[PDB]
Design a protein around this ligand. Structure first.
Ligand SMILES: Nc1ncnc2c1ncn2[C@@H]1O[C@H](COP(=O)(O)O)[C@@H](O)[C@H]1O
Ligand SMILES: Nc1ncnc2c1ncn2[C@@H]1O[C@H](COP(=O)(O)O)[C@@H](O)[C@H]1O
Ligand SMILES: N[C@@H](Cc1ccc(O)cc1)C(=O)O
Ligand SMILES: N[C@@H](Cc1ccc(O)cc1)C(=O)O
Ligand SMILES: [Mg+2]
Ligand SMILES: [Mg+2]
Lengths: 428, 428
RNA sequence: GGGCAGGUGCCCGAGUGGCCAAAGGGGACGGUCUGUAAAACCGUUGGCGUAUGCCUUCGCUGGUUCGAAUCCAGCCCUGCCCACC
RNA sequence: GGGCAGGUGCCCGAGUGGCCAAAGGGGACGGUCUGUAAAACCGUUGGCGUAUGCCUUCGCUGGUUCGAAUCCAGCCCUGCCCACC
């Protein structure tokens, strides 16, 4: 067990801000399970490692005995959180969010404990649909226009002449009322959620509730190296991606992001992180990719993604990435495939596509149209352009003839770029 | 009967703006009773001649066969229309507005026809209370922040650092939704209502309705000569004030307001108004005061407050105010009292106040405390100050001794200023 | 409700009758080099099976012109400015 | 959530330890003059029945001081600036 001070110190690790920090300490001394809120608007399906930053911290709360309330923003997602936005969000239907919501519920359990005393799922439509005009008037009366416009995206858009739809100013009051509805002790979020979390405190005060602690985590940067990991930016690693693909993507995280990936996605000690960085960028990537590929290949990540877990998998810490043959089978194969492809090899397991003979012309298929039929190129023009840039291979050889007519009398291995492969064959 | 063109020309008289004017002409050619909307938030009891400006125009619509829908803003009045406001309005309870609402319903009929085919009363709580959060989101999505802040009071307050409560930006959508609820063809208002009326058009378009014509009347200036007549400014003449008081107040309208009072409150022709102004300010006041004192002494004003009506009362147009002995008894007495008081006389009918002998000190009452007991002064200090300024009279003589101890062995006539009188006497 | 400007490619954004699948910057994509990284460098960034060609393309719908992303008109939406004060 | 400034009389607003029931402007109120108007001019704009006095008074609650509208602290609310990007 932990004392309240020990609890707070553990929870602080990796956090950007706990505010008011003294209030979390005081709540931790109450000797009761705290209600820890996280909302997520399912505007697109699937969770990624950026979501894992806040969810892993919530798992830490659960391992300390506190209760997570995961709010599916089926109602709020219809609106669109303008936080950080450069322009107004497109609306979605309640049915749209609830289809995406199914993935969130299924995937959240890959990180969160699911025992009821530690976890409860809510849909904010449960209470937001019945909120009446009079109540909305009284809620919005709690803040002024000048106060609302302080939020960075409102200030910048207004000063630049970029439209702000008035309904965007109602969204924070929905999120904040959610905290009243579930009597939140703590609200989790990335740093981008800071303003809405603070409105939560204001609305709770107005409803006579203790104002929640706002618990802010730093944002994981995406694979591009600059922007926050997000679905819209197509720079993300999904929690349910096959180990093969997760391992490859983690190996390609830009080197300057390694410390934050270790701090936000693992529990390694600071000296352990420095030790991996001493070994060098590639060894450090191998350990990161092994830890997380293994953890997310499990049905649920362990309570600690630490050195002990690493060795649990069969790896040796003092090998610093050299022991490639160790580990869970799924991870070992993923790393083996990564290295085989890196050296110019073709993996043995590659997707298969059968081409109907009705596509043949003079008994063959023009190479450009063949790659579009295989799903590797969006258009024949693009296939031609990739050939001009030496981006396509046929049975391992770089294509130099954009007019090549390909013989499919036997299966052929098509390759686009570094590691997209398809074997094509014919069928009547 | 009137043609649509004749109808529009009549309705234009006195109006500041009909917009789109061509749309009113087209509605008038439809050959059906148009729904003519007026909302009024009963934030204080009683209607005044400023309200009469818009209500008389509505009466004109009714006399042309169109249907008034008078909306009591029992719900909106709880919020507070920020239009023209220098600061945020104080909220009221639904019970508060509905007590004030009783006066509005009773007094509106002094101007409006009350036959159902010409008149229907609604309370906007009828439909606004059931408006749901989702619907409010969709309503507010119809306008942006920059669009909302164009309204003069929002722009000036925001640029000056004067707070605007966010709920003030919801009010126009309530007023506008009211137009959807009753399918308004026309919305009436003073010029101060222009922005909210135009939002009405936008919301009607979004609900697939023909957008209402916005019918704007100029604001009647109050007795102070500068500000719009309003209860808050204490510069108004109430529709139900006794003829005695209405006549006196109309005689004291500043001379530069006479043309607008004739144009907005009577139907006299422009050449008739000039003819009265030629007679001089006082004659012109006598005719104005007679016309309106008579009209509002009736249970309902006539369809035309014109020269024919004037002569109907027994006055002679070519006497230009000299025939003081003519007219309804109530008006003749009011004018007689006005002139008697002007020449320093005391009227025969004056309020009576009985003072209990328990107020006596050495068998008398200090003059200052006597005026406070009579209701003429708010405090003895103020009575003393008024004596120093020669503002109080006792039995017609100007009081010069602020220490006077008044003998009440017989009734005494107290006077404050020009025309506030009270007769005081004793009782055990 | 009135005026003016604007909406363009993955994003921002230039166009300023033809030189436009479209400047410049960013991004993304391919390659060299490697470490399936970065940087640097070169290239690509509507579609079409015979191409000196065909189809589609700058908010929507039309119009003038041999030719419109560009000019005109109606309409939608936005910003600024009016109106309201 | 952090900082700074602010809330004063009917309104705006000055105060800058005592000279404060409180500058200045507006408004309102009384009077002269009249037209029960305006303008101009003079005056008034916390309360109290013996006044060289008593009571209350500058967002709320306390505090320092002989004395606080003024200085200090906690709290409420606002504006600007942070945070968020
Ligand atoms: N890349 C990220 N790093 C850390 N937290 C994130 C990231 N992306 C989303 N979140 C958090 O996950 C929640 C849902 O975010 P979103 O998916 O953007 O609606 C919010 O609390 C976010 O701050
Ligand atoms: N002095 C006035 N002159 C003309 N119309 C007025 C006046 N006062 C109020 N109204 C109109 O009466 C309606 C209610 O106004 P209010 O009493 O200010 O809530 C609105 O349409 C106003 O424009
Ligand atoms: N605003 C959060 C979602 C959310 C929804 C409801 C809440 O109560 C809290 C958060 C997001 O952008 O994903
Ligand atoms: N806004 C109007 C009242 C009103 C209420 C409802 C309406 O639908 C229209 C007008 C006022 O200030 O008095
Ligand atoms: Mg406009
Ligand atoms: Mg703040």
């Amino acid at each position: 067990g932990h004392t309240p001070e020990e609890a707070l110190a553990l929870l602080k690790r990796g956090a950007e801000e706990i505010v008011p920090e003294e209030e979390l300490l005081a709540k931790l001394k109450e000797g009761r399970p705290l209600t820890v809120k996280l909302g997520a608007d399912p505007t697109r399906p699937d969770l990624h490692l950026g979501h894992a930053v806040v969810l892993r911290k919530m798992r830490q709360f659960q391992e300390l005995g506190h209760k997570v309330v995961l709010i599916i923003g089926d109602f709020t997602g219809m609106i669109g959180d303008p936080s950080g936005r450069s322009k107004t969000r497109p609306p979605l239907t309640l049915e749209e969010t609830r289809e995406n919501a199914k993935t969130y519920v299924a995937q959240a359990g890959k990180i969160l404990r699911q025992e009821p005393h530690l976890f409860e799922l809510r849909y904010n439509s449960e209470w937001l649909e019945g909120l009446t005009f009079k109540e909305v008037v009284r809620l919005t009366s709690l803040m002024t226009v000048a106060q609302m416009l302080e939020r960075e995206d409102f200030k910048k858009r207004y000063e630049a002449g970029i439209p702000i739809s008035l309904h965007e100013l109602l969204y924070p009051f929905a999120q904040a009322y959610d905290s009243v509805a579930i009597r939140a002790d703590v609200e989790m979020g990335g740093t981008d959620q800071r303003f809405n979390l603070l409105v939560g405190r204001e609305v709770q005060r107005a409803y006579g509730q203790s104002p929640q602690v706002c618990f802010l985590m730093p944002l994981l940067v995406g694979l591009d190296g600059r922007e926050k990991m997000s679905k819209s930016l197509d720079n993300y690693i999904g929690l349910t991606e096959p180990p093969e693909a997760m391992f490859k993507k983690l190996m390609r995280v830009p080197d300057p992001l390694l410390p934050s990936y270790f701090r936000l996605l693992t529990d390694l000690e600071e000296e352990e992180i420095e030790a991996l960085l001493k070994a060098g960028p590639v060894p450090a990537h191998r350990v990161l990719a092994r830890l997380l590929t293994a953890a997310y290949a499990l049905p649920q990540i362990p309570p600690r993604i630490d050195r002990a877990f690493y060795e649990s998998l069969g790896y040796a810490w003092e090998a610093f990435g050299r022991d490639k043959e160790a580990g869970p089978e799924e991870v070992r194969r993923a790393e083996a495939r990564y290295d085989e492809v890196a050296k110019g090899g073709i993996p043995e397991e590659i997707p298969e596509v059968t081409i109907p003979a009705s596509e043949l012309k003079e008994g063959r298929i023009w190479v450009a149209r063949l790659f579009t039929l295989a799903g590797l190129t969006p258009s024949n023009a693009e296939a031609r352009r990739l050939i001009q840039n030496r981006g396509l291979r046929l049975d391992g050889e770089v294509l130099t003839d954009p007019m090549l007519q390909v013989d499919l009398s036997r299966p052929r291995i098509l390759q686009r770029g570094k590691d997209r492969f398809v074997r094509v064959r014919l069928s009547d």
